[PDB]
Coordinates of C-alpha atoms and ligand atoms in Angstrom, one line a residue:
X16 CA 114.7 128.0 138.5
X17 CA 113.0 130.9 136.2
X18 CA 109.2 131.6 136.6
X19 CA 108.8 130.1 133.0
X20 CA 111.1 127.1 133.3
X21 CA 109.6 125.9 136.3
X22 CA 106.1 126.1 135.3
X23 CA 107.2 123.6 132.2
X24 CA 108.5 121.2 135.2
X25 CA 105.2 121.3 136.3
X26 CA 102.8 120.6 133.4
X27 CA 105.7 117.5 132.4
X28 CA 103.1 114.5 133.2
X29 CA 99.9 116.6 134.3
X30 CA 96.9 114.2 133.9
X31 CA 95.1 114.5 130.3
X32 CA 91.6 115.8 131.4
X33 CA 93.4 118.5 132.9
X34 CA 95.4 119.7 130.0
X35 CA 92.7 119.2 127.7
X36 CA 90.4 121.3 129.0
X37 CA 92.7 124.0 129.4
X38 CA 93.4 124.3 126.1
X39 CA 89.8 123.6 124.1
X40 CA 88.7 127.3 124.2
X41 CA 92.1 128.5 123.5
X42 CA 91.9 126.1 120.5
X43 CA 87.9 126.7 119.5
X44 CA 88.0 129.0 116.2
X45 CA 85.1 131.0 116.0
X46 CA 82.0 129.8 114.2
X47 CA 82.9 132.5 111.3
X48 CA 86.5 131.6 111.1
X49 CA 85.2 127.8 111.8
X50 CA 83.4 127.9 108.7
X51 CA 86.1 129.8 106.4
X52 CA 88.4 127.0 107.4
X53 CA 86.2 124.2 106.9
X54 CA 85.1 125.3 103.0
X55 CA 89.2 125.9 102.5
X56 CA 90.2 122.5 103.9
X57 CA 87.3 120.9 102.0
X58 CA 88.6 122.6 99.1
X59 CA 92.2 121.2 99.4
X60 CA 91.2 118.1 100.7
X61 CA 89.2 117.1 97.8
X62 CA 91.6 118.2 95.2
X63 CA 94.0 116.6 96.8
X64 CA 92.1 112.9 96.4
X65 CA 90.2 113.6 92.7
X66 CA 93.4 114.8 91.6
X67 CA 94.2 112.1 89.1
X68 CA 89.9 112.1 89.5
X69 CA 90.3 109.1 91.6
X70 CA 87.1 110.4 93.1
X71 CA 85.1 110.7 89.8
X72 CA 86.3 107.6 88.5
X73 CA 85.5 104.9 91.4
X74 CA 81.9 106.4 90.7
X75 CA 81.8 105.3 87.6
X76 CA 82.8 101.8 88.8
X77 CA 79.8 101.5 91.6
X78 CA 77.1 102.6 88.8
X79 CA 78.2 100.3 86.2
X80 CA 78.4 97.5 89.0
X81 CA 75.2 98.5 90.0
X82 CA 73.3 98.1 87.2
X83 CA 75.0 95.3 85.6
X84 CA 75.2 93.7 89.7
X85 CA 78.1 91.1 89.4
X86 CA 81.3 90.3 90.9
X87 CA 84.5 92.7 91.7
X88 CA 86.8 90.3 89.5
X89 CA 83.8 90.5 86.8
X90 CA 84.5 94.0 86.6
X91 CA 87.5 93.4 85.9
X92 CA 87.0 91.0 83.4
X93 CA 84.6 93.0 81.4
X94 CA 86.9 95.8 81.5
X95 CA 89.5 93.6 80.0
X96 CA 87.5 92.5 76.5
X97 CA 86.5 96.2 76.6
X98 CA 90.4 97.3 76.2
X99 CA 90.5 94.3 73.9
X100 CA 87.3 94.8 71.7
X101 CA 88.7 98.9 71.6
X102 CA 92.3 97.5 70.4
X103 CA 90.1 96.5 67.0
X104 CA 90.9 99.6 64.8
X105 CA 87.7 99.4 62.7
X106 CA 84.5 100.2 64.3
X107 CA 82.0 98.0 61.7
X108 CA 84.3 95.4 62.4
X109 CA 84.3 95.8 66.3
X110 CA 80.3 96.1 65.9
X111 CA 80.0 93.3 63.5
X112 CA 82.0 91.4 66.1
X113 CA 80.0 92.4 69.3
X114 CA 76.5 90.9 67.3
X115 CA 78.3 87.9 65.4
X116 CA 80.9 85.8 67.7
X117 CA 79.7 87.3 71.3
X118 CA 94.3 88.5 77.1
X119 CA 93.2 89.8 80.6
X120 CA 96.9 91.4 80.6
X121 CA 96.4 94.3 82.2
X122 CA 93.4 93.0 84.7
X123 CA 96.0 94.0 87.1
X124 CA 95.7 98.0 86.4
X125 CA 92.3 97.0 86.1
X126 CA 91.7 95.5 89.4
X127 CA 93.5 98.7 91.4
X128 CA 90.3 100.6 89.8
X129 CA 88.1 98.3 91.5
X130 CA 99.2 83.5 101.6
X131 CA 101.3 80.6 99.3
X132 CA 103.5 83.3 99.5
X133 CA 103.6 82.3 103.4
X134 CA 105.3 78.8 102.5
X135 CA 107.7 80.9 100.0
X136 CA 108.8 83.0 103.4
X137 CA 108.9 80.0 106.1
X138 CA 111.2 78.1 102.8
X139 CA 113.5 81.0 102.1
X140 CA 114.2 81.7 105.6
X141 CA 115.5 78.4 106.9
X142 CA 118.2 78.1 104.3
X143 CA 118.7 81.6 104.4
X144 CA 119.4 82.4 108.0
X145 CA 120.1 85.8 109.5
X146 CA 122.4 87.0 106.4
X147 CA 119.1 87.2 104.2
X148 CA 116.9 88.8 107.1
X149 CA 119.8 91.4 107.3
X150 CA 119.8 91.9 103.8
X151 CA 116.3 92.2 103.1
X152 CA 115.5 94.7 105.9
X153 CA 117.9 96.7 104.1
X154 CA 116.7 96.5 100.6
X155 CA 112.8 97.4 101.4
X156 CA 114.6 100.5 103.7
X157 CA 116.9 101.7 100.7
X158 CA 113.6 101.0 98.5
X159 CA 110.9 103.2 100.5
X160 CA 113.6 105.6 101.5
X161 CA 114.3 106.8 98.1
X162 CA 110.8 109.3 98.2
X163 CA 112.0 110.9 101.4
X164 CA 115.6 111.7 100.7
X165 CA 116.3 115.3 98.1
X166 CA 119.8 114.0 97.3
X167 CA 123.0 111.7 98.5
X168 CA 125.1 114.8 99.1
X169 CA 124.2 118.2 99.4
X170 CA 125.2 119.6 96.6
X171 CA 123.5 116.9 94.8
X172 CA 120.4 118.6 96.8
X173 CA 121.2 122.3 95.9
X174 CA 120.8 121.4 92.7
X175 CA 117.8 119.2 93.0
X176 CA 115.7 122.6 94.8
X177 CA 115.4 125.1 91.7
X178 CA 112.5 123.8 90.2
X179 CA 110.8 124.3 93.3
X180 CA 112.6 127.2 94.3
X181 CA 111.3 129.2 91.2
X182 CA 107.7 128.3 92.3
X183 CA 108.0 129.7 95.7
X184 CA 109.5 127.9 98.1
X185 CA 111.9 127.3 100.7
X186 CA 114.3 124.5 101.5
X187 CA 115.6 122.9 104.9
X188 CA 118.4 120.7 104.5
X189 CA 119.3 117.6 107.0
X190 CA 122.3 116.2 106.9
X191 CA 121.0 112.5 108.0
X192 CA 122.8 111.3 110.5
X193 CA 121.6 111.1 114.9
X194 CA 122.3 109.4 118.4
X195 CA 126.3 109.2 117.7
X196 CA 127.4 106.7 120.1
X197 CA 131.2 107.2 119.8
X198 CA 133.0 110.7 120.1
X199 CA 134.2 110.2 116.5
X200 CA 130.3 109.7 115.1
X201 CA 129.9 113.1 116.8
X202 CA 132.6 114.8 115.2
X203 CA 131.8 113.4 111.7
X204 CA 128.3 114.8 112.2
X205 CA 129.8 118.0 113.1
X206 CA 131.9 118.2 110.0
X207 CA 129.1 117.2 107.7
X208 CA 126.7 119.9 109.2
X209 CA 129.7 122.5 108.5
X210 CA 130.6 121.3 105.2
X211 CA 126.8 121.9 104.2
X212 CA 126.3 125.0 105.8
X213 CA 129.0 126.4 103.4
X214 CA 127.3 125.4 101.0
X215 CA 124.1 126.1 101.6
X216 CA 125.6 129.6 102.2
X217 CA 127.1 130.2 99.1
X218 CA 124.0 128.9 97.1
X219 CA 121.7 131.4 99.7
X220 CA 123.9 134.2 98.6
X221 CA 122.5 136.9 100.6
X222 CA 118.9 135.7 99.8
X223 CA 118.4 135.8 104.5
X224 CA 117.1 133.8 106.8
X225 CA 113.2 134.4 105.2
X226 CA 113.5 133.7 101.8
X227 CA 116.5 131.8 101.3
X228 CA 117.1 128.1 102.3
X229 CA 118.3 127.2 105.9
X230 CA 119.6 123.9 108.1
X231 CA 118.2 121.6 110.4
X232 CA 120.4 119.9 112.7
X233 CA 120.2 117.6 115.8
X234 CA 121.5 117.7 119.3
X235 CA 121.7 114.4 119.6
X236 CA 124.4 113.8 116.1
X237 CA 126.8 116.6 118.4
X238 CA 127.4 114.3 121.0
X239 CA 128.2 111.1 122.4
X240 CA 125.2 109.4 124.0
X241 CA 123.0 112.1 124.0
X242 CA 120.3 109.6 125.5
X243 CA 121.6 109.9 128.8
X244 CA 124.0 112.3 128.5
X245 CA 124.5 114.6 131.9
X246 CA 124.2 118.6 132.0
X247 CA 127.9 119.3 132.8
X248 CA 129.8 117.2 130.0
X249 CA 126.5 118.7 127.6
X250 CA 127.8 122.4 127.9
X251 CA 131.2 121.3 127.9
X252 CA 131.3 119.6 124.3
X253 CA 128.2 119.9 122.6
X254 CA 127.5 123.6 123.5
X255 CA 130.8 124.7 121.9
X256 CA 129.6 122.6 118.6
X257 CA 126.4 124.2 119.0
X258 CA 127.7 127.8 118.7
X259 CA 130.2 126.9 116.3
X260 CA 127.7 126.2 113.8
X261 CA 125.2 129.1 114.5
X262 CA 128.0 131.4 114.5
X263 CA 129.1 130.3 110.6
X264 CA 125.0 130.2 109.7
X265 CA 125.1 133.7 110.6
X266 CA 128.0 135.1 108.7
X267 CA 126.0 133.2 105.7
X268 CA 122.9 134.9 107.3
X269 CA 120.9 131.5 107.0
X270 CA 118.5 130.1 109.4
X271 CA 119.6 127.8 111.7
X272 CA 117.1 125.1 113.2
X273 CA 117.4 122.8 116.0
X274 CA 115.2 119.8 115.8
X275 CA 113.2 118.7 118.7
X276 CA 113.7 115.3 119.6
X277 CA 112.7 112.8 122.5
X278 CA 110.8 114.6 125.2
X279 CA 113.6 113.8 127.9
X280 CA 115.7 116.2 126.6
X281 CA 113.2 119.1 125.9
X282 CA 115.1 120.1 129.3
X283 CA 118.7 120.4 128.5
X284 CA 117.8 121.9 124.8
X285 CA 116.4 124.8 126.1
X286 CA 119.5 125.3 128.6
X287 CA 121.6 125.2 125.0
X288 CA 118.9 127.6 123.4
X289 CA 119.1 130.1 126.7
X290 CA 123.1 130.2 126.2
X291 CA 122.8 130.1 122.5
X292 CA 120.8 133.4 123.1
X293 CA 123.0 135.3 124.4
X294 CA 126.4 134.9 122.3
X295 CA 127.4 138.9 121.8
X296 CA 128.2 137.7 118.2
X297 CA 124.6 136.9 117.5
X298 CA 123.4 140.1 119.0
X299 CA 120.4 141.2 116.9
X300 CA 120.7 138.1 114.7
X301 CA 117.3 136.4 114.1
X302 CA 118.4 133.0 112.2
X303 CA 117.9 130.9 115.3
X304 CA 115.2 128.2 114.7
X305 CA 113.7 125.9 117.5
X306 CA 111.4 123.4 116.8
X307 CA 108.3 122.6 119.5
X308 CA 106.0 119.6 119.0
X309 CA 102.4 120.1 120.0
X310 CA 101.8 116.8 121.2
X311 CA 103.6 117.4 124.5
X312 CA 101.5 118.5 127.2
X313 CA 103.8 121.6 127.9
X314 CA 104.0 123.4 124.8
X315 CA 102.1 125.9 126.2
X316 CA 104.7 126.6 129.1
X317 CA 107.5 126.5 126.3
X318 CA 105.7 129.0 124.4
X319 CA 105.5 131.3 127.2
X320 CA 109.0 130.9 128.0
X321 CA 110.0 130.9 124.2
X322 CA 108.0 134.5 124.2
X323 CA 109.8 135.7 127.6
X324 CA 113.3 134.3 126.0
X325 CA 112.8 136.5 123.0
X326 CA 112.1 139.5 124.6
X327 CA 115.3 139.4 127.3
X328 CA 117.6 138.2 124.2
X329 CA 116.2 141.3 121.9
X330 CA 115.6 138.9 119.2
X331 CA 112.8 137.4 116.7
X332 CA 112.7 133.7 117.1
X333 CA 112.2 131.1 114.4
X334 CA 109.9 128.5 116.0
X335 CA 108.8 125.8 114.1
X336 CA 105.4 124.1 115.7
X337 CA 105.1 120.8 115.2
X338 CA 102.8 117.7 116.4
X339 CA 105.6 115.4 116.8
X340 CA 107.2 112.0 115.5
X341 CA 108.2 109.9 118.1
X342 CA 104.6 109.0 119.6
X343 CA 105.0 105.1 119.2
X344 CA 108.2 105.7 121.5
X345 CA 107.2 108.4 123.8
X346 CA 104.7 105.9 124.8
X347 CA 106.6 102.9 125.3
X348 CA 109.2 104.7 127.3
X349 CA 106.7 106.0 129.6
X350 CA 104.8 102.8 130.0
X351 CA 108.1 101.0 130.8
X352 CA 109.3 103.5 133.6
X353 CA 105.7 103.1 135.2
X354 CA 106.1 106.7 135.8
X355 CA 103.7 108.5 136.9
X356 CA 101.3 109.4 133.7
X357 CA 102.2 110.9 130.1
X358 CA 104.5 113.5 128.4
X359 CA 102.4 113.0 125.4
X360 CA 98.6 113.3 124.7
X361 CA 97.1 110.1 124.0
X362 CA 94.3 110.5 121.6
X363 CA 95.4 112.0 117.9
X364 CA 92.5 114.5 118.3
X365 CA 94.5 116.3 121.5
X366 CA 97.4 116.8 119.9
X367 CA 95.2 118.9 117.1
X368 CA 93.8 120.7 119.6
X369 CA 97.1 121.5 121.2
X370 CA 98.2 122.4 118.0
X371 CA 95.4 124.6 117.4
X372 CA 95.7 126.2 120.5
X373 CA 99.8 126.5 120.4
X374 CA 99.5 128.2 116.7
X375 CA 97.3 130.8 118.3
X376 CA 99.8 131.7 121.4
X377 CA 102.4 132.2 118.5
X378 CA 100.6 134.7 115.9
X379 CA 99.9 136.8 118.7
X380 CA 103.2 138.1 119.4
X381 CA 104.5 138.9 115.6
X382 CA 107.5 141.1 117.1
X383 CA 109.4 137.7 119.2
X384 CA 108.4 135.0 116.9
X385 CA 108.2 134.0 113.3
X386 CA 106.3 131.2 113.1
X387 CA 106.4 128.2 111.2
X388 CA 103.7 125.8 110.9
X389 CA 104.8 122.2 109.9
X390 CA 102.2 120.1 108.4
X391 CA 100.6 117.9 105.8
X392 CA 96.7 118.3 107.1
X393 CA 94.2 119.9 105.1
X394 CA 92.4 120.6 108.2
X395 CA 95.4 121.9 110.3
X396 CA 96.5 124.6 107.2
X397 CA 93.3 125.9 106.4
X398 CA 92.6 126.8 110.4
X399 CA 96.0 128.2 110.3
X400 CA 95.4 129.9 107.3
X401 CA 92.6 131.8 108.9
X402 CA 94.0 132.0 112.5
X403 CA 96.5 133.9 111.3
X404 CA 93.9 136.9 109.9
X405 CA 93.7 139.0 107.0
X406 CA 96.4 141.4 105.4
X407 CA 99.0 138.2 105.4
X408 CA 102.8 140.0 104.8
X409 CA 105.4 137.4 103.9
X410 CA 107.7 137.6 107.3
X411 CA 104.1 137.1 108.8
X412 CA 104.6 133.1 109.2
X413 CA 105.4 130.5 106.7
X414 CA 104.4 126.7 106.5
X415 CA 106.7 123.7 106.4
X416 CA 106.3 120.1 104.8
X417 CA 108.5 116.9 104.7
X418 CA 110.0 116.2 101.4
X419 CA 107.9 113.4 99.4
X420 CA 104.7 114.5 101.9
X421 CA 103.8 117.8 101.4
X422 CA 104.6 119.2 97.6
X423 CA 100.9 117.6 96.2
X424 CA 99.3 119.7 99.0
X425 CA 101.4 122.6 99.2
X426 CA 101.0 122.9 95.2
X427 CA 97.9 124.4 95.8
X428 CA 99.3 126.9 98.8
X429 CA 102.3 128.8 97.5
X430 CA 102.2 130.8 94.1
X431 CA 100.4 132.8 92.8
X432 CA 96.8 133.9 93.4
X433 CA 96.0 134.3 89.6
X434 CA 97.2 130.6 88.9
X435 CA 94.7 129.7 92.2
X436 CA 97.2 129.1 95.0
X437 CA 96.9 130.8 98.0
X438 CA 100.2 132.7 97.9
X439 CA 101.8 131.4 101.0
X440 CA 104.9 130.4 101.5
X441 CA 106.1 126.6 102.3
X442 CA 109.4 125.3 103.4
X443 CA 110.4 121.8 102.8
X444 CA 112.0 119.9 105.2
X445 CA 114.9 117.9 102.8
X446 CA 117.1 114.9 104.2
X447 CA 120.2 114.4 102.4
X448 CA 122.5 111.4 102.7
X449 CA 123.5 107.8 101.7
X450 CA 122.0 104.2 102.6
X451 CA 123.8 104.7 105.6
X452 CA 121.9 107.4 107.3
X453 CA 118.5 106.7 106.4
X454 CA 116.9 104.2 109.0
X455 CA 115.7 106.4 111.8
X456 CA 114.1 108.8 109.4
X457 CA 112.8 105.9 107.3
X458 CA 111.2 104.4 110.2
X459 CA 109.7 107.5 111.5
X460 CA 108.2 108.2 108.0
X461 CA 106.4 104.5 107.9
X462 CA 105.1 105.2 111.3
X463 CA 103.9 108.1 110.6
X464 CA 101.5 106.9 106.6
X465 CA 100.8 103.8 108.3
X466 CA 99.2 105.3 111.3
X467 CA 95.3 105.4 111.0
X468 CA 95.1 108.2 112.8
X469 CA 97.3 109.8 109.9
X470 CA 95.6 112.3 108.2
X471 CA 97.6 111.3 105.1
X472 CA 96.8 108.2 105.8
X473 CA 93.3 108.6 105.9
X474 CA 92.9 111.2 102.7
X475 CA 93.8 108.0 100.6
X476 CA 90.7 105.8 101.9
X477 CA 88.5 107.3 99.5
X478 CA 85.8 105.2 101.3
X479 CA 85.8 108.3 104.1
X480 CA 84.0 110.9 103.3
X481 CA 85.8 114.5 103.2
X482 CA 83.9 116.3 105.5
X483 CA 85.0 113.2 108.6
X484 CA 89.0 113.6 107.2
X485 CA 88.7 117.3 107.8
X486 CA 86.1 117.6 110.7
X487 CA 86.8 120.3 113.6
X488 CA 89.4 118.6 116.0
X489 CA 87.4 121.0 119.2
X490 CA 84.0 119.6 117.9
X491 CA 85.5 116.1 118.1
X492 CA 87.0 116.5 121.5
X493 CA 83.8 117.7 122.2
X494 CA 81.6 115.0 120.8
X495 CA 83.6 113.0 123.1
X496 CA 83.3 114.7 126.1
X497 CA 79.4 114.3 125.9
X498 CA 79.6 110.4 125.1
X499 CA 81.7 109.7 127.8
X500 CA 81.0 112.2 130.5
X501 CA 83.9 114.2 130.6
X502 CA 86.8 116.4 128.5
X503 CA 89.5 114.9 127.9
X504 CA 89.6 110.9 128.7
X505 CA 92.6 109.3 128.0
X506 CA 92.8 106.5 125.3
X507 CA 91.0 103.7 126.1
X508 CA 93.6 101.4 124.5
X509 CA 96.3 103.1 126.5
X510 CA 96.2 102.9 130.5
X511 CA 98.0 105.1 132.5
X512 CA 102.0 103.8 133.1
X513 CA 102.0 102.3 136.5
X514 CA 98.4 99.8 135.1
Ligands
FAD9 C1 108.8 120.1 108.0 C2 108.5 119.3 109.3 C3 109.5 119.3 110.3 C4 109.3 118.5 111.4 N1 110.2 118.5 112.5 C5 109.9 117.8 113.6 C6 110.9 117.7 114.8 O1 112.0 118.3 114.7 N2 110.5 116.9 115.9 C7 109.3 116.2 115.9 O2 109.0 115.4 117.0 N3 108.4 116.3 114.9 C8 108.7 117.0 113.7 N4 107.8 117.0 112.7 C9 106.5 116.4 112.8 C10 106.4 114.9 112.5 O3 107.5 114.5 111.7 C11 105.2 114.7 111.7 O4 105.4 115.1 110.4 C12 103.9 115.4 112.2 O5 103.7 115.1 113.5 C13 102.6 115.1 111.4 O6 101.6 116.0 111.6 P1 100.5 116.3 110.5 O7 99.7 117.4 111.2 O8 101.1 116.6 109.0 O9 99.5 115.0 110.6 P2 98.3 114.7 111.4 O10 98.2 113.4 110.9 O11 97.1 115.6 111.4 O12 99.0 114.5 112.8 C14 99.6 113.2 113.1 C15 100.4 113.4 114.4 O13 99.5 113.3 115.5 C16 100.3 112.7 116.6 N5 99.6 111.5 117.1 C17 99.3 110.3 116.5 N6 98.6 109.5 117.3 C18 98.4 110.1 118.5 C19 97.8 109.8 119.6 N7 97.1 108.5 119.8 N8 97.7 110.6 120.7 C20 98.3 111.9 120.6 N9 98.9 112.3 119.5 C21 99.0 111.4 118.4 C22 101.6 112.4 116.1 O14 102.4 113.6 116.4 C23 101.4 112.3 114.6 O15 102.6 112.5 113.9 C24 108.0 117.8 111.5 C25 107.1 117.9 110.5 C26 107.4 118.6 109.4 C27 106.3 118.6 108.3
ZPS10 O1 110.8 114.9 113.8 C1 112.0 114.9 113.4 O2 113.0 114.9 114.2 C2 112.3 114.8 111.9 C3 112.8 113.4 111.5 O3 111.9 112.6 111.2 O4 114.0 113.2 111.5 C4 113.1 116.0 111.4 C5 112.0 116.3 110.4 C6 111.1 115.3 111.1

């Protein structure tokens, strides 16, 4: 093999102390930049949560309760002949009132500021059977899938990105859709992703791979069975789709980005990337994109291949760094195979620190890669935002962001300085398709707010306090290392596979 492929054969499963302590000081941002990134994530964290001043206003509630020292539902209930006794349109008579004689409606908006349903469920179920099951499962999916998607077709989508586009920003378009399992599912997803490349072109319209939108797509929609699919039938049919594709995103000149998907096949995806690479008709063409996710324990050895990859295909890559969102199932699979350890880190607070340490390896080489930093943390942009040093130029890096994650935070990153933004760039990642197409993503996306170890998920508990949402990911790897007596445990929750 290579020099760089087989050293990312050898970190696959390497145990987590290891890797962890390898990376920290690549990660550790010096106490000046430490501090820089901490006031700036501060900053965006805590607009984020007093936006609507939900902050402010639960302060309000724990004085009053305080003084007055009575129940949560009493709150509630004095709020309510508040709202009531302000409804009286003269004050001497409200007064009057108050002195002389001395309905809960919207208690409920009240109580926000401050298990018979059980016998319902085991009732409806019996008489119900599996048709209701099947049918409800797909009515909550339709219902919290609706914030995720930009549009049912994409043109619908095109449209939909204007606003946002005047502000600033950049689009991704998905056409929903993975893990055919026939040869026909393959080639529909191959004609969708055509189909919206045209028109993604023609609405680009010379804008380039930089400023104007660009396509995601996944392996694993180009061919049958991709799960186990074997390396000779891959580069027979799905390579051929592969180029296809790039080859028409380049007469558009639009970026082009492959998705990174399960960790098995972070092998064969680079073999299409190598190939890709090398196509004469891309020949100094830098639309490529490639997704890594941080949480795997060789990103590092990706990177360095990436970087060597660049440089002997005379060409500026378009990586986009990642954590990942398949955890729940990288974890699973590898338990089940009693393998020998991990692909994955196992503590939330390693992957951060790979990130950290990943974003680093990439702004150093400006000339092979354009990177692009995918998140929705506070924490992880503002470290980002000052890895990446001073005299920013826009084909520098950009960030990314999930549609119906991202805009609240990135509202405050790209526009202008004047109007207090930061003047970075952010591209938004946007799904477009029908009921049909939406499960994976949907489920991925309720994995990934429910998580407690979500920072999104965490910004919302306004009962922890900003500066543990946006502490230092080294310092807590740290803080660890000197409770338990060494860098880089595994989770305690999560034995190693063959346990
Ligand atoms: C625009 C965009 C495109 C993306 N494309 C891809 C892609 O092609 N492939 C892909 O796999 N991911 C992709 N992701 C990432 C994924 O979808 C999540 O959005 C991302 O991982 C969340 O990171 P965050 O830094 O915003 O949140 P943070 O909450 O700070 O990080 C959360 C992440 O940490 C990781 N994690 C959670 N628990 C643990 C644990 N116990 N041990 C170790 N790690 C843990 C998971 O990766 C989790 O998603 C993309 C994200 C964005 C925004
Ligand atoms: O991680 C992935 O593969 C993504 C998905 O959820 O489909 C694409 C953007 C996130």
């Amino acid at each position: 093999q290579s020099v760089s492929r087989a050293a990312i054969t050898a970190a696959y499963r390497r145990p987590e102390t290891e890797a962890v302590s390898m990376l920290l000081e690549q990660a550790r941002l010096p106490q000046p930049v430490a501090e820089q990134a901490h006031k700036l994530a501060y900053q965006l964290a805590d607009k984020l949560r007093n936006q609507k001043n939900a902050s402010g206003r639960a302060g309000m509630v724990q004085g009053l309760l305080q003084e007055f020292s009575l129940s949560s539902q009493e709150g509630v209930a004095l709020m309510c002949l508040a709202e009531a006794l302000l409804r009286i349109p003269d004050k001497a008579t409200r007064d009057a009132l108050i002195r002389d004689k001395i309905l809960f409606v919207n208690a409920a908006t009240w109580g926000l500021l401050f298990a018979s349903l059980s016998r319902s469920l085991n009732r409806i179920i019996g008489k119900s059977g599996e048709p209701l099951i099947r049918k409800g499962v797909d009515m909550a999916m339709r219902l919290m899938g609706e914030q995720f998607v930009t549009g049912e077709t994409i043109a619908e989508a095109l449209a939909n990105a204007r606003k946002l586009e005047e502000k600033g920003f950049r689009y991704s378009y998905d056409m929903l859709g993975e893990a055919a399992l026939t040869a026909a599912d393959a080639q529909a997803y191959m004609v969708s992703y055509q189909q919206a490349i045209h028109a993604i072109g023609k609405a680009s319209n010379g804008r380039g791979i930089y400023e104007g939108p660009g396509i995601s797509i996944k392996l694993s929609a180009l061919h049958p069975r991709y799960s186990r699919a074997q390396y000779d039938r891959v580069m027979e049919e799905l390579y051929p789709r592969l180029k296809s594709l790039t080859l028409l995103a380049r007469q558009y000149d639009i970026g082009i980005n492959i998705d990174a998907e399960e960790s098995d096949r972070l092998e064969i995806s680079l073999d299409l990337l190598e190939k890709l690479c090398f196509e004469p008709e891309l020949a100094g063409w830098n639309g490529i994109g490639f997704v890594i996710q941080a949480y795997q324990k060789r990103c590092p050895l990706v990177i360095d291949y990436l970087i060597d990859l660049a440089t002997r295909s005379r060409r500026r890559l378009m990586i986009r760094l990642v954590k990942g969102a398949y955890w729940d199932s990288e974890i699973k699979r590898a338990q089940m195979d009693g393998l020998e350890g991990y692909p994955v880190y196992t503590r939330k607070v390693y992957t951060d620190v790979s990130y950290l340490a990943c974003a680093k390896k990439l702004l150093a080489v400006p000339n092979l890669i354009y990177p692009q930093f995918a998140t929705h943390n506070a924490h992880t942009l503002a470290a980002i935002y000052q890895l990446a040093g001073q005299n920013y130029y826009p084909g520098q890096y950009e960030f990314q962001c999930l549609h119906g994650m991202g805009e609240p935070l990135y509202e405050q990153v790209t526009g202008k300085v004047a109007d207090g933004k930061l003047n970075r760039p952010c591209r938004i990642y946007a799904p477009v398709g029908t009921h049909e197409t939406l499960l994976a993503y949907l489920v991925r996306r309720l994995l990934e707010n429910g998580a407690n170890t979500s920072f999104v998920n965490r910004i919302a508990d306004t009962s922890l306090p900003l500066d543990e949402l946006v502490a230092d990911p080294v310092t807590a790897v740290e803080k660890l290392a000197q409770q338990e007596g060494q860098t880089g445990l595994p989770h305690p929750k999560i034995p190693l596979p063959r346990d």
